[PDB]
Amino acid sequence: STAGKVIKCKAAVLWEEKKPFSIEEVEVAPPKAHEVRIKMVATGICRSDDHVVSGTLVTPLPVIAGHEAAGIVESIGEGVTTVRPGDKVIPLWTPQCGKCRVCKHPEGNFCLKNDLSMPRGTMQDGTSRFTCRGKPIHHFLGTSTFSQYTVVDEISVAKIDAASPLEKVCLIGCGFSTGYGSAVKVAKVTQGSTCAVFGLGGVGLSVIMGCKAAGAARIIGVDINKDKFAKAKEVGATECVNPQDYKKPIQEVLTEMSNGGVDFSFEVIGRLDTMVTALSCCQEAYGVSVIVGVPPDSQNLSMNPMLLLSGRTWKGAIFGGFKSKDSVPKLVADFMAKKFALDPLITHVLPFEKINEGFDLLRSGESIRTILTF
Amino acid sequence: STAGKVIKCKAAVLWEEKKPFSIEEVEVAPPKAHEVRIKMVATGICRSDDHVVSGTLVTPLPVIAGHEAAGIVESIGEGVTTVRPGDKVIPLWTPQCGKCRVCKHPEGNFCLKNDLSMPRGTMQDGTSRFTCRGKPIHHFLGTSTFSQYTVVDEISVAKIDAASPLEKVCLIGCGFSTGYGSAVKVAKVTQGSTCAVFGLGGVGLSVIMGCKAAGAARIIGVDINKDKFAKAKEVGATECVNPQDYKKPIQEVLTEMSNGGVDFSFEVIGRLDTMVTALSCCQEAYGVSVIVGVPPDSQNLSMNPMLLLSGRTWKGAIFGGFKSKDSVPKLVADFMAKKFALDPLITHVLPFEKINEGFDLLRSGESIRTILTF
Ligand SMILES: NC(=O)c1ccc[n+]([C@@H]2O[C@H](COP(=O)([O-])OP(=O)(O)OC[C@H]3O[C@@H](n4cnc5c(N)ncnc54)[C@H](O)[C@@H]3O)[C@@H](O)[C@H]2O)c1
Ligand SMILES: NC(=O)c1ccc[n+]([C@@H]2O[C@H](COP(=O)([O-])OP(=O)(O)OC[C@H]3O[C@@H](n4cnc5c(N)ncnc54)[C@H](O)[C@@H]3O)[C@@H](O)[C@H]2O)c1
Ligand SMILES: [Zn+2]
Ligand SMILES: [Zn+2]
Numbered sequence: 001s002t003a004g005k006v007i008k009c010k011a012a013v014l015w016e017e018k019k020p021f022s023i024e025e026v027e028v029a030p031p032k033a034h035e036v037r038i039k040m041v042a043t044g045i046c047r048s049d050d051h052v053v054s055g056t057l058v059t060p061l062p063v064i065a066g067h068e069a070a071g072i073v074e075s076i077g078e079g080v081t082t083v084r085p086g087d088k089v090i091p092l093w094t095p096q097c098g099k100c101r102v103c104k105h106p107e108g109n110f111c112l113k114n115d116l117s118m119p120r121g122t123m124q125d126g127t128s129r130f131t132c133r134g135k136p137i138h139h140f141l142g143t144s145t146f147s148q149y150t151v152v153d154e155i156s157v158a159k160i161d162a163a164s165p166l167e168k169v170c171l172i173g174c175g176f177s178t179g180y181g182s183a184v185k186v187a188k189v190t191q192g193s194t195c196a197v198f199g200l201g202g203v204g205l206s207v208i209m210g211c212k213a214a215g216a217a218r219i220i221g222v223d224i225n226k227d228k229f230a231k232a233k234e235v236g237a238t239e240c241v242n243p244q245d246y247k248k249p250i251q252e253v254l255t256e257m258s259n260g261g262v263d264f265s266f267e268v269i270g271r272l273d274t275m276v277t278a279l280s281c282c283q284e285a286y287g288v289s290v291i292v293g294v295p296p297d298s299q300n301l302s303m304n305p306m307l308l309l310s311g312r313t314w315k316g317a318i319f320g321g322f323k324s325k326d327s328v329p330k331l332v333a334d335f336m337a338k339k340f341a342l343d344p345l346i347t348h349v350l351p352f353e354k355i356n357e358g359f360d361l362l363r364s365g366e367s368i369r370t371i372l373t374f
Numbered sequence: 375s376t377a378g379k380v381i382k383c384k385a386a387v388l389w390e391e392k393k394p395f396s397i398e399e400v401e402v403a404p405p406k407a408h409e410v411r412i413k414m415v416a417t418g419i420c421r422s423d424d425h426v427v428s429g430t431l432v433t434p435l436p437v438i439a440g441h442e443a444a445g446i447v448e449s450i451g452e453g454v455t456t457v458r459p460g461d462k463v464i465p466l467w468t469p470q471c472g473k474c475r476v477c478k479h480p481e482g483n484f485c486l487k488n489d490l491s492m493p494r495g496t497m498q499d500g501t502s503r504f505t506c507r508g509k510p511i512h513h514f515l516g517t518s519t520f521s522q523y524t525v526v527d528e529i530s531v532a533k534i535d536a537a538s539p540l541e542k543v544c545l546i547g548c549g550f551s552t553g554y555g556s557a558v559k560v561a562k563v564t565q566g567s568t569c570a571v572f573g574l575g576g577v578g579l580s581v582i583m584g585c586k587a588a589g590a591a592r593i594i595g596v597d598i599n600k601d602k603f604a605k606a607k608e609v610g611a612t613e614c615v616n617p618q619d620y621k622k623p624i625q626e627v628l629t630e631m632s633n634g635g636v637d638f639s640f641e642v643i644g645r646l647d648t649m650v651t652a653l654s655c656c657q658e659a660y661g662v663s664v665i666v667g668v669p670p671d672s673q674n675l676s677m678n679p680m681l682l683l684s685g686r687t688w689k690g691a692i693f694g695g696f697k698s699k700d701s702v703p704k705l706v707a708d709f710m711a712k713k714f715a716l717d718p719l720i721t722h723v724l725p726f727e728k729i730n731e732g733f734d735l736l737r738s739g740e741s742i743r744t745i746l747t748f
């Protein structure tokens with residue numbers, strides 16, 4: 001069979017920026033020492049995958065994007081001790097080497113072995129496991145889930161429950177855990193508080209779930225797309241406001257509504273203006289603002305340091321603050337315990353082949369989470 | 375006796391920006407309901423007082439500046455209950471009304487009744503108690519301590535120990551409490567941590583005292599005036615660096631020194647660039663930066679939000695996070711109990727009349743804190 005041999009399969013390759021994904025046949029080399037080869041089962045389309053296409057998030061091209069997924073272990077390389085063939089796993093785009101200063105720190109989660117800070121687009125050893133048309137293709141965040149088969153290092157994978165519905169749980173690999181963690185873990189939303197969430201996509205709706213789970217008394221959803229409002233309220237939002245409905249800036253509206261400003265605000269979009277607006281709408285003396293959105297490559301925002309001096313706290317976070325490998329299996333166990341619902345996030349389920357169409361649904365605002373089944 | 379009558383005395387009035395203080399005679403109206411007239415015994419020269427002169431911190435002119443001091447209650451208006459004539463007290467440039475949103479929050483201290491955000495330069499009732507040359511003179515942060523007598527609202531005054539040495543504990547009215555509370559209360563410095571403090575002045579040296587007390591293992595002091603280093607070491611600094619000695623940017627130097635970044639960083643200067651530099655040198659996934667310095671009016675800083683996305687926490691604070699009315703008395707009691715020392719901060723003591731030379735000592739970089747005696 002396939003073990004130890006080169007496998008040929010279909011992958012969605014992005015050759016150029018702003019071009020559609022090309023469904024190609026690629027050759028996936030076998031797992032080297034401390035690597036694992038995975039058979040993909042389901043993969044969600046996250047806006048960050050779209051940032052690569054738009055040139056917003058720069059990573060070496062050509063590449064096989066995709067990072068929000070769930071699959072099954074096909075083979076493991078020499079030295080692997082955390083997973084074995086036939087094991088259901090979720091690849092980790094934010095690794096957990098367990099040995100750097102971040103992993104050793106009780107709170108940091110942005111492991112130094114990550115490939116997001118300075119994208120090399122390769123494996124930990126600096127080489128690629130993908131070949132298409134004889135040309136080496138880059139990896140994306142050490143995951144590359146838009147492929148029937150993918151190879152990831154041991155530090156970038158977690159073993160999860162054997163009874164896990166992989167087509168639902170793949171959301172824990174990004175969107176959900178990110179939004180949920182930003183609220184309960186990072187911001188530390190308090191019972192009775194008033195929160196504001198800018199952006200009601202898959203990650204934004206998950207922030208709303210975190211806040212509701214944390215006990216927030218009031219949760220204001222903000223989005224320029226009013227069609228997103230029903231789902232927001234469905235998952236926990238008390239009210240939703242659309243900026244274009246107002247003659248005066250939204251931070252002013254939010255300040256008046258909350259009688260001085262919100263307790264916690266989240267930016268879950270990726271725009272420089274909304275990041276400052278979110279900071280501004282939280283209470284000046286003790287408000288917390290968390291940036292969840294990924295900003296456009298090489299751009300600086302402008303803000304008045306006085307917003308901070310008065311007492312506000314501004315933070316940012318990757319993967320919702322969770323140490324990936326420790327937390328991923330745990331969230332799956334909690335999902336299984338029926339502790340939270342993922343369904344409201346899944347709006348479309350399409351075959352992997354219909355990849356470009358799932359992206360078209362995102363860009364147009366028709367979808368929240370589209371899962372691609374292989 | 376002076377009770378109920380207008381008092382004519384000397385005060386340093388600032389008529390124009392960038393101009394010397396004019397020590398002259400002013401009339402100090404008696405205290406109205408819930409106001410207190412105080413005789414000033416000692417007052418410190420904080421850099422914020424110089425910001426007014428330079429126009430860095432905008433407050434209506436002509437004004438009687440000064441906000442870090444100590445004195446004795448001369449008379450109380452109707453309804454005053456928290457202080458009585460003969461009490462030693464410290465004027466609070468940050469009030470504690472106890473009724474508003476911020477006062478009732480367990481963490482916040484920036485009282486809504488403050489005159490720092492929207493400076494009117496008057497009493498809580500919109501009127502002034504100062505007259506010079508027939509012309510009304512403005513108050514500053516509701517304290518105006520550069521006067522032999524001053525009137526403050528009850529919410530802006532705290533009674534301290536009857537045995538307190540006013541010429542020393544006056545620094546508790548601002549410089550010390552600010553720097554100290556920034557480390558232990560705001561940034562919450564941990565045992566064994568590496569800290570960096572930009573600005574080795576009265577407030578910065580006090581930050582170092584807070585880090586030492588919190589157990590910091592390493593505390594690097596940054597200043598372009600190498601003369602400040604000896605006193606820094608003396609109060610806690612393990613090492614000191616002068617950005618001018620290096621060919622490469624200090625955030626790089628500091629990052630390499632602490633093997634990937636400091637745990638906590640403090641900007642205690644008031645410059646836009648050092649605020650950004652301070653954030654950048656703390657560890658990217660769990661570093662915490664605290665802005666203590668007062669920035670130039672209406673000037674915005676430019677920064678890359680990725681600095682925060684990776685996991686950094688950015689916050690600022692007024693008066694070290696201390697609820698003024700609550701904290702001040704306890705801090706004076708601890709001083710008495712010898713829990714901390716104020717002496718290393720005091721480098722020059724001058725009679726009030728020498729106020730102008732005191733400010734020149736601050737500008738020449740020769741002093742830390744000059745106490746002015748009445
Ligand atoms: N920090 C992390 O670990 C992490 C993880 C996942 C995703 N992200 C980033 O988080 C962001 C959200 O991803 P998502 O998958 O939920 O995206 P999404 O595209 O599904 O949702 C974005 C939403 O924000 C809205 N919006 C756009 N402009 C707006 C504006 N000007 N004002 C108000 N609302 C506006 C859109 O209508 C949309 O509903 C992206 O930038 C993604 O790259 C970060
Ligand atoms: N947030 C608050 O509640 C609060 C309270 C008190 C004072 N402050 C502010 O804190 C700041 C410091 O006050 P201070 O009284 O200690 O002032 P200070 O003038 O005594 O100290 C400033 C120090 O920074 C140094 N410095 C200047 N430029 C530098 C540079 N480019 N790089 C590194 N170091 C540099 C100066 O040499 C000096 O030693 C001020 O801006 C003041 O207004 C804020
Ligand atoms: Zn994602
Ligand atoms: Zn690590």
Ligand SMILES: [Zn+2]
Pocket residue numbers: 420421422423441442548549
């Ligand atoms: Zn001051």
Ligand SMILES: [Zn+2]
Pocket residue numbers: 469470471472473474475476477485486487
């Ligand atoms: Zn108050």
